[PDB]
């Protein structure tokens, strides 16, 4: 009955985004410069996350180190040795008293920073997943949503240490997830060239979006929570609307033949920042599908990319062992 | 220049000193990725010289091998983690001719991957005692040695080396070794071949290549 779904999606398609936004003033050529270069990690950066306080960020590297930086002063607040050097995700708690990570160990390890006269130690270890841990995001100090390479996502209880609900209907390894601003839903993009919208309370899939052509690598919710973007291996970013249940934009240009590693939006949502495997990053007009800027400062591969909560800066880590703050 | 700020810079300085101390020992050790099929018997080589982590030291140089097997059979995504390894170890069941095609295609996909094109591969044809007693591919009729067990072992090695030399030039190399079931010298092999690999990178950065 997928033909009926395609017909229903076609029936509601009456104004393309390229047509309804053809009389909108284009933004200027976005020229951003590096402000800080973070130079303390030994090997390639794999992930990064921003603190809610918009000053502190955590990062992960191939050398099995978890460094918490002070972006204003470039000073390392923490340097946490991990039991496994193979990690791919970082999570900063909204309260700021916890940090999580994970990877090929298939375990989300949680580290308590605000200890009593003691260094940072592993507070908990969540060990119910089967495939490699791809992404994790704190809901609060006691709940964390995790995705892995066993084609499943799970919501955990940190105090008890076992899963509360599991989001099992998916094909291919789930590569990224993005929490809604209301924290009641989340979208996950996997390696089956599809993305799904999940309900945290109900534990069921409500929508599926199958516009892309290859493995989806990054996913980011729109600031109002009514849309999201997906960066995939087909060298194309696309924009999907939850209400319309169809793709709206396709941020694809010729001479781009590399996959998108990271995807993030600005505070207003006008700019879509996408990291690429062609050593550099791109700035996209979200409602015009035209290039607006390039962050060409990295040397090996832009693996992670995040925009600050207040939107004052964008931090992009890279495979050259350096993080960069842009403005 | 406040007291709290000065304490923050002092703590960052101590952290950076510890980071330099860790960098001293991180570059002095070598990471090895262990790959192969289920019947390859790679764990036999692991236990002889000892996600499973195996640490051993040869000539006071520390090697650390990783046998990741807690995953699914779709490895196009998590194999990018083993990008800065000194070498990839491939273990092949040379005595089970049914699966040599899949092993050859696996080595071919490892060879031509964009994220593994600069990483050298050490090859171990493991089950050689079973191959000798035992003795599909139609090239064995016209193949000539560069008894028949020598022809078979060097023919499989030549198939692997043909795939290796078909596309990999000047960035990474293949090292075929003929492993046995009760070999006690694969640590020396891994040491010498990692030594050759680092010598090749040295010659590249010394502008001599």
């Amino acid at each position, epitope marked *: 009955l*997928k033909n009926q779904i395609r017909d229903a999606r076609k029936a509601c398609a009456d104004a393309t985004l390229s047509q309804i936004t053809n009389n909108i003033d284009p933004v200027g050529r976005i020229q951003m410069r590096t402000r800080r270069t973070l130079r303390g990690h030994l090997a390639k950066i794999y992930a990064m996350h921003w603190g809610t306080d918009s000053r502190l960020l955590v990062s992960a590297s191939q050398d099995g180190k978890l460094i918490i930086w002070d972006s204003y002063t470039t000073n390392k607040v923490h340097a946490i040795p991990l039991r496994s050097s193979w990690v791919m995700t970082c999570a900063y708690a909204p309260s700021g008293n916890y940090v999580a990570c994970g990877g090929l160990d298939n375990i989300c390890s949680i580290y308590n920073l605000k200890t009593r006269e003691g260094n940072v130690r592993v507070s908990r270890e969540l060990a119910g997943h089967t495939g490699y841990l791809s992404c994790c995001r704190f809901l609060d100090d006691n709940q964390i949503v995790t995705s892995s390479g066993d084609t499943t996502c799970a919501l955990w209880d940190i105090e008890t240490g076992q899963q509360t609900t599991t989001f099992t209907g998916h*094909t*291919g390894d789930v590569m990224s997830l993005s929490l809604a601003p209301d924290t009641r839903l989340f979208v996950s993009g996997a*390696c*089956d*060239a599809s993305a799904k919208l999940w309900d945290v309370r109900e534990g069921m899939c409500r929508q599926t979006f*199958t516009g892309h*052509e*290859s*493995d989806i690598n990054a996913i980011c919710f729109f600031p109002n929570g009514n849309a999201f973007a997906t960066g995939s*291996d*087909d*060298a194309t970013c696309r924009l999907f609307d939850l209400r319309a249940d169809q793709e709206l934009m396709t941020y694809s240009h010729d001479n781009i*033949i590399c*996959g998108i590693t990271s995807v993030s939006f600005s505070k207003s949502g006008r700019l879509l920042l996408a990291g690429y495997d062609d050593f550099n990053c791109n700035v996209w007009d979200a409602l015009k599908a035209d290039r607006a800027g390039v962050l060409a400062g990295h040397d090996n591969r832009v693996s992670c990319l995040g925009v600050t909560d207040d939107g004052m800066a964008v931090a992009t880590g890279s495979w050259d062992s350096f993080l960069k703050i842009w403005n | 220049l406040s007291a709290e700020d000065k304490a923050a810079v002092e703590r960052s300085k101590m952290i950076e000193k510890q980071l330099q101390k860790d960098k001293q020992v991180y570059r002095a050790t070598h990471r090895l990725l262990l790959l192969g099929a289920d019947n390859s018997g790679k764990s036999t080589i692991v236990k002889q010289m000892r996600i499973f982590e195996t640490k051993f030291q040869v000539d006071k140089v520390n090697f650390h091998m990783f046998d990741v097997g807690g995953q699914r*059979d*779709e*490895r*196009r995504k998590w*194999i990018q983690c083993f990008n800065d390894v000194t070498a990839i170890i491939f273990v092949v069941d040379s005595s089970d001719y049914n699966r040599l*095609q*899949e092993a050859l*295609n696996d080595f071919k*996909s490892i060879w*031509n*991957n*964009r994220w593994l094109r600069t990483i050298s591969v050490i090859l171990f044809l493991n089950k050689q005692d079973l191959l000798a007693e035992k003795v*599909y*591919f*139609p*090239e064995f009729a016209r193949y000539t040695t560069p008894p028949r067990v020598t022809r078979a072992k060097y023919f499989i090695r030549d198939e692997f080396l043909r795939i290796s030399t078909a596309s990999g030039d000047g960035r990474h190399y293949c090292y075929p070794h003929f492993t046995c079931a009760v070999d006690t010298e694969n640590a020396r092999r891994i040491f010498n071949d990692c030594k050759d690999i680092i010598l090749q990178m040295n010659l590249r950065e010394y502008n001599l290549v």
Partner: nanobody, 126 residues
Framework: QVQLQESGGGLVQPGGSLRLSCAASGFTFSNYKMNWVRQAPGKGLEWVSDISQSGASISYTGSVKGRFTISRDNAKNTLYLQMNSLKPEDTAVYYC?????????????????????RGQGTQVTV
């Protein structure tokens, strides 16, 4: 939605000949490397053929060379496996497979137990 649909699966004597054609849809045909994936009663997932995006590089399994010549049509979005020298040891289910990424001949995960960009398959019985 990446959809691949095959055809041309019917009972054939040890002699004779047959042809398989997979009709690709939902993606750009000419940017990807494609292959042929074989099954059998009570064994795993095999690998028969291979062709590049341009069509200038062809690889075969050691037991299919000279008998299972292939073709592709970037204009018609089709890929073929012309079967001419059949044997009774060829009863299989044939899936038209695809490399995970464009400009990428990795096809790292083509013959996996679960693969997203693989067709449903046609039973070729003998």
């Amino acid at each position: 939605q990446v959809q691949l649909q095959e055809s041309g699966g019917g009972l054939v004597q040890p002699g004779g000949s047959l042809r398989l054609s997979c009709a690709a849809s939902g993606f750009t045909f000419s940017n990807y490397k494609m292959n042929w994936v074989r099954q059998a009663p009570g064994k795993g997932l095999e690998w028969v053929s291979d062709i590049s995006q341009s069509g200038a590089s062809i690889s075969y399994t050691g037991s299919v060379k000279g008998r299972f010549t292939i073709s592709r049509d970037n204009a018609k979005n089709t890929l073929y496996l012309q079967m001419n020298s059949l044997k009774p040891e060829d009863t299989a289910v044939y899936y038209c497979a695809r490399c995970p990424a464009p400009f990428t001949p990795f096809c790292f995960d083509v013959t996996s137990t679960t693969y997203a960009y693989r067709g449903q398959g046609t039973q070729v019985t003998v």
